[PDB]
Structure 1
């Protein structure tokens, strides 16, 4: 049976605008993976939301019945006629023909909201970016290409909070992996806002997913690789690992705080992680350095995006007993 594997990705970065999907494309290519933006399942166009007094984050702006059916149909080999939501015009355009593929990724605000869609998913990620991090990135991006559109991200973040808390954040409790990005704890007065602290929160007891750990699975550790063999600037790099309880479930939390100044530092860290699901020594580093220009490229953000990709590849290869698709050269 030519098996379709379904992957849910939850985040607020907007469709086609996340670094994480570009990294997935780097790993799985674009021929045998198709990405579906869930905004296509809006029941209400832009005028309709205004008329009803709701945001795009509200369940009521979205058609989960149609979502479930078309996703179920794709997993079952059928072609679908799925609507197109045009973000410019704010209208719902005529349907697109989508055929099944080895990997279908569903991306957007509510891939984990509906119970029936959840059960169709083989792997899920929630990207949890602290506000202040989201803001400082936007300023860094703006500063480069002369955009100055960061006041509007802020505006959007404050105003979205109620709906974000009500309807988006609780999906974190159904995600296999949550990537949590926040400001550093290594610098007393972080004026720069560059150095990040990142947690990979990995749900336990999802058969066919073994969490990455450091040193000893199921016990708690804090680790600094800088020492006799590895010279770091200040404040250096610090990892932590340990069991925890998140949204009522057992998890295992892997954490990196700091910045990688170079190769040696990345590899040294990779080399000492366990169950990373790399297929050769230094695959994380190689994949991470593929594209140095992405934000998070030199910190735990990029590292844990790539690692999450590898856990997806493992899930896929477990379900199909076949090699996952790969990017070209």
Structure 2
């Protein structure tokens, strides 16, 4: 029967090893496993692992995915309709018989091409893109320089042709970069992280520092917070990005204790937390998650808070 329910559709774009499973685990801390259903878009591969090898294409290739079928079932789910979704088996590399997916209050589609097809794009209510510099992405996989570099060098043509342009369509881009606080760094364990927040989505107001419309460089270490060198550095300001207006929040360095975390949170505006300290609580809820001490975990939680705010906004009427 007809319903007043508004199913909210969310997209998470990125390659593997880009913190995507970590990000989805943090979203579970905010929504739970009950009313959120997560769909790995690899299920819409048209070619299985042996098929892609014999056709000579990677999984990044659009000719190895069925966007007609993806759009059919995502649209059906958003109409409160039950679907029979195929299953891609990452172990055996095969496309297994389908399973029954029931519509939920929140549908999150995640994978390589959630923002690639305009038909699916029009269905999404909010989206992220996890952007990892080839420098940082190389450092994560290596933690053999030669063999990894070759691995990411073979995939980059497909990546820049089909994957990277999705950044222009995301409401939020989480960009991970090498640090600027350490001269000639080798390990890439300290990270400079940016939260690129697009202007345009109807109710989505960006988190900011001090003044939402202007540019600030801020070092929180001082008379009220002690840090060891090099410390923490933050930035905020308007900018343009793929021809659209954005608000960029930035953080560089590591949090070495809880006091530095709550100090930064207390000085951020419009984080959409529901109580003072919720950002720090969620960030420390899983100490083992990678990035729990720097800007990657911080901005993942912040992005989820924006999704929660977009969800509560869409389901208020």
How well do the aligned residues superpose, as a CA RMSD in angstroms?
1.7
Deviation of 1:120 (Å): 0.4
Deviation of 1:133 (Å): 1.8
Does the residue aligned with 1:239 lie in a helix, a strand or coil? strand
Give yes or no for the alignment of 1:236 onto 2:231. Answer: yes
Consecutive unaligned residues in structure 1, runs of 5 or more: 141-148, 323-329
Does the residue aligned with 2:20 lie in a helix, a strand or coil? coil
C-alpha distance in 1, partners of 2:38/2:259?
35
Residue 319 of structure 1 is matched in structure 2 by 314
Residues 265, 10 of structure 1: alpha-carbon distance in 2 compared, 3 angstrom cutoff: same
Residue 96 of structure 1 is matched in structure 2 by 99
C-alpha distance in 1, partners of 2:54/2:47?
10
Residues 150, 86 of structure 1: alpha-carbon distance in 2 compared, 3 angstrom cutoff: farther
Does the residue aligned with 1:120 lie in a helix, a strand or coil? coil
Deviation of 1:304 (Å): 0.2
C-alpha distance in 1, partners of 2:141/2:31?
28
Deviation of 1:153 (Å): 4.8
8 Å contact kept, 1:14–1:108: no
Consecutive unaligned residues in structure 2, runs of 5 or more: none
8 Å contact kept, 2:18–2:137: no
C-alpha distance in 2, partners of 1:199/1:189?
20
C-alpha distance in 1, partners of 2:195/2:19?
22
C-alpha distance in 2, partners of 1:79/1:16?
30
Residues 290, 4 of structure 1: alpha-carbon distance in 2 compared, 3 angstrom cutoff: same
Residues 150, 306 of structure 1: alpha-carbon distance in 2 compared, 3 angstrom cutoff: farther
C-alpha distance in 1, partners of 2:67/2:186?
43
Deviation of 1:90 (Å): 1.7
User: More displaced, 15-24 or 187-196?
Assistant: 15-24
8 Å contact kept, 1:15–1:37: no
Residues 93, 159 of structure 1: alpha-carbon distance in 2 compared, 3 angstrom cutoff: same
8 Å contact kept, 1:8–1:123: yes
Does the residue aligned with 2:218 lie in a helix, a strand or coil? strand
Residues 50, 176 of structure 1: alpha-carbon distance in 2 compared, 3 angstrom cutoff: same
Deviation of 1:189 (Å): 2.0
C-alpha distance in 2, partners of 1:22/1:107?
13
TM, length-normalised to structure 2: 0.95
8 Å contact kept, 1:138–1:150: no
- Number of corresponding residues: 314
8 Å contact kept, 1:15–1:108: no
8 Å contact kept, 1:291–1:297: yes
Does the residue aligned with 1:112 lie in a helix, a strand or coil? coil
Residues 76, 304 of structure 1: alpha-carbon distance in 2 compared, 3 angstrom cutoff: same
C-alpha distance in 1, partners of 2:37/2:8?
11
Does the residue aligned with 1:136 lie in a helix, a strand or coil? helix
Does the residue aligned with 1:315 lie in a helix, a strand or coil? helix
TM, length-normalised to structure 1: 0.92
8 Å contact kept, 2:75–2:123: yes
Residue 326 of structure 1 is matched in structure 2 by none
Residues 64, 169 of structure 1: alpha-carbon distance in 2 compared, 3 angstrom cutoff: same
C-alpha distance in 2, partners of 1:17/1:153?
20
8 Å contact kept, 1:15–1:107: no
Deviation of 1:15 (Å): 10
Deviation of 1:175 (Å): 0.2
Alignment of 1:260-279 (within 5 A): 260-279=255-274
Does the residue aligned with 2:92 lie in a helix, a strand or coil? coil
Residue 22 of structure 1 is matched in structure 2 by 25
C-alpha distance in 2, partners of 1:21/1:53?
31
8 Å contact kept, 1:204–1:251: yes
Alignment of 1:1-329 (within 5 A): 1-13=4-16, 18-140=21-143, 153-321=148-316
C-alpha distance in 2, partners of 1:318/1:152?
47
8 Å contact kept, 1:7–1:123: yes
User: More displaced, 255-264 or 83-92?
Assistant: 83-92
Does the residue aligned with 2:203 lie in a helix, a strand or coil? coil
8 Å contact kept, 1:201–1:252: yes
8 Å contact kept, 2:86–2:97: yes
